[PDB]
Design a binder for this molecule. Structure first.
Ligand SMILES: *[C@H](N[C@H](CO)C(=O)O)c1c(COP(=O)(O)O)cnc(C)c1O
Ligand SMILES: *[C@H](N[C@H](CO)C(=O)O)c1c(COP(=O)(O)O)cnc(C)c1O
Ligand SMILES: [Mg+2]
Lengths: 410, 410
């Protein structure tokens, strides 16, 4: 009935709920959060300014806010096995900024994964505060295997002499060896920071090795595979680092935290501590593998590194369509959303790319299994193969509606 | 019933809803958002990654997100009379960071209001990124009048030669002359940034003259007097500056925006565009004047600057209780929340202070008027006079309960 006061706004919110229902979401970073997560960030906790930390706030009337934030901190520590957690970062990007501010100074040398191989903007892009403030040098995957080569990264680190190595990626499909990253860091006297945003849910589910025992500091989004609200999180085992991180988040970088979003983080972290989260992770892994297998067996398509051991994979589409932007646009026509993506050693424009990135988390959260995941990948191959046949795309779009009706979003 | 799964979290949220109902909220930054604002940030908009700007997103299936974000932008532009708006900043601190990144360089000199006279942490505190990155040199209020002296500030600017002047405050009761601030900036070829976070509601209601025609760039929180969700907003009339601001917010400082929060910004901005919002502003002014008048007349209390023309005022409490912190602790015992606050030329430790800060927006949103405001101020005078008479406090707590039951929070 507040809806009656603002139809243009509430019409658009209702349309987005229906678009999410009627579309197959394969964007590897996306998920479907619980009713409980959305309800928690729709609470009157937005009415309370909580500058500072539990028991050490700028203002009064914060005793109950302190219970909520302490639940989020304790559940993070328990879930990831860390001695310290900071649940205030507004975003993964703000989490990363606080860690740089805590460990290094402006102009220090940092190594981060190449943006074409899956490094984030905040891992040294020149258009990011990261690239503008610090001296980032990128490491890549091997050109032939498309795998991290820890011997090559070591040789580069001994030349570059970084103060900090950043590990973690948004387009890398294989198991990262975090013990090797920390061995590299230790060999050159560098800090190791792991941004586990993409894989945090699989770390929580037991399906990906934890960086937490190896990274001086671990950052993540609470969204993506962890299936939480949009925000950031920082972990460490080192009490002196924890004090600097806390001061860097507030008052270094942010002011008041979003305590309604932190309530939602507490909700999501308790959902990830449930035994049912292990089964989620297992279905995320099986579902992503079942899609990759369709592309591996098709002669016209190549999966980057030959497959996946996580939630995502990339496909070189350039034997079937001109570039990944074309592939993204064709699949959108049949109500399948994914993103064009640069492949390692990408030769085409970053606006076009050679690739698509596919993820399983959102379709897994809707209850889909291996048979549905395989059928979705068969529709992708068929749509790209027949991109100039409207009657084909029309039929695939109608088949997609039967599957979305069968696996309702909420 | 999702709440059965997590009673510790949902019991804490019920405990905060009761705490807010049974508390008289005088923290001058606090407010009571509409059910519509909370509902918008509890939507499945949290599921969509919207890196980029409307029509220029990193990913597809963003055409409905684009309508929502464009409503927030169009409403900010219409409400404040600005040619350009950015609704993505996660916070007021993030909005300010993007403006500095757009207009100046590290090491550049900036003038901002002294932190003791109500400058924000992000206006050059040494523990903020603001003081760490830029050379902040404060202007103060007149020691006698506790007013801004535009002649004194002009002389200081001619001597310091800042690249940027920051105006706006968290603890200043009087009308800030934005036309004079622009004259001062113009005299030295500085940019003028106004942070209107505390007064944006009064600007929107017509009760404070707008900085928007005078500042090169205006920042604000969407929360505080504007009565929106927690977040930031940037306004400018200069198209070249607007492009720099857009790049600085993303990919300069942030990654994906909180589109659920942006929907709530669009909701709050439509509310502020309503004729009822003028009546809200009217009552905020009246209620604050009413409380200020009680302290003005009582002989044991001085109001800083001797009164208010906005939503807040400060009171020197040191003749009645040892320090502002003691006053905060005592009023907490009778279910009245405000904060200890430094006064101009504060002499005591920042952890104690001589002052309390009081504002009207929250009690005004609960539907209270001049009578209840006068009454609340009488209760505050009485509790502080009788601070070690346990039975006087207990009886005030009871009178407070009658008022809170009379004006239900929701
Ligand atoms: C509000 N913050 C002050 C501390 O609450 C206050 O006294 O009211 C404020 C901001 C807040 O930015 P965040 O959203 O916390 O990052 C920024 N600018 C000004 C002038 C404020 O008053
Ligand atoms: C998410 N990054 C990309 C877009 O979502 C992606 O390709 O998946 C991400 C972040 C995001 O931080 P924000 O909350 O948007 O600031 C940070 N770090 C990594 C590794 C990501 O994948
Ligand atoms: Mg506080």
């Amino acid at each position: 009935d507040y809806k009656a006061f603002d139809p243009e706004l509430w019409n658009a919110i209702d349309a987005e709920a229906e678009r999410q229902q009627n579309n197959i979401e394969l964007i590897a970073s996306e998920n479907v959060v619980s009713k409980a997560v959305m309800a928690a960030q729709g609470t009157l906790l937005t009415n309370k300014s909580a500058e500072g930390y539990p028991g050490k706030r700028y203002y009064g009337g914060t005793a109950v806010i302190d219970v909520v934030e302490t639940l989020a901190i304790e559940r993070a520590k328990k879930l990831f096995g860390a001695k310290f957690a900071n649940v205030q970062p507004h975003s993964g990007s703000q989490a990363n900024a606080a860690v740089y501010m805590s460990l290094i100074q402006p102009g220090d040398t940092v190594m981060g994964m190449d943006l074409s191989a899956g490094g984030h903007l905040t891992h040294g892009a020149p258009v990011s505060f990261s690239g503008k403030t610090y001296n980032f040098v990128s490491y890549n995957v091997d050109k032939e295997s498309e795998l991290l080569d820890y011997d090559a990264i070591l040789a580069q680190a001994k030349e570059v002499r970084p103060k900090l190595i950043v590990a973690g990626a948004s387009a890398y499909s294989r198991i990262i060896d975090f013990a090797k990253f920390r061995e590299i860091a230790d060999a050159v006297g560098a800090y190791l920071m792991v941004d586990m945003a993409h894989i945090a849910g699989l770390v929580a589910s037991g399906h990906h090795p934890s960086p937490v025992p190896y990274a001086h500091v671990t950052t993540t989004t609470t969204h993506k595979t962890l299936r939480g609200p949009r925000g950031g999180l920082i972990l460490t085992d080192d009490e002196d680092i924890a004090k600097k991180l806390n001061s860097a988040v507030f008052p270094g970088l942010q002011g008041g935290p979003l305590e309604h979003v932190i309530a939602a983080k507490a909700v999501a972290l308790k959902e990830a501590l449930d035994p049912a989260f292990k089964e989620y992770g297992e279905n995320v892994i099986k579902n992503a593998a079942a899609m990759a297998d369709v592309f591996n067996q098709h002669p016209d398509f190549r999966v980057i590194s030959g497959g996946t051991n996580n939630h995502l994979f990339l496909v070189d589409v350039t034997k079937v369509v001109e570039n990944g932007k074309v592939a993204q646009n064709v699949l959108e026509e049949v109500n399948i959303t994914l993103n064009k993506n640069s492949i390692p050693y990408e030769q085409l424009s970053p606006f076009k790319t050679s690739g698509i990135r596919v993820g399983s988390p959102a379709i897994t959260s809707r209850g889909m299994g291996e048979a549905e995941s395989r059928q979705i990948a068969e529709w992708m191959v068929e749509a790209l193969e027949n991109h100039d046949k409207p009657e084909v795309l029309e039929r695939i779009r109608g088949d997609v509606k039967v599957l979305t009706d069968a696996f309702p979003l909420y």
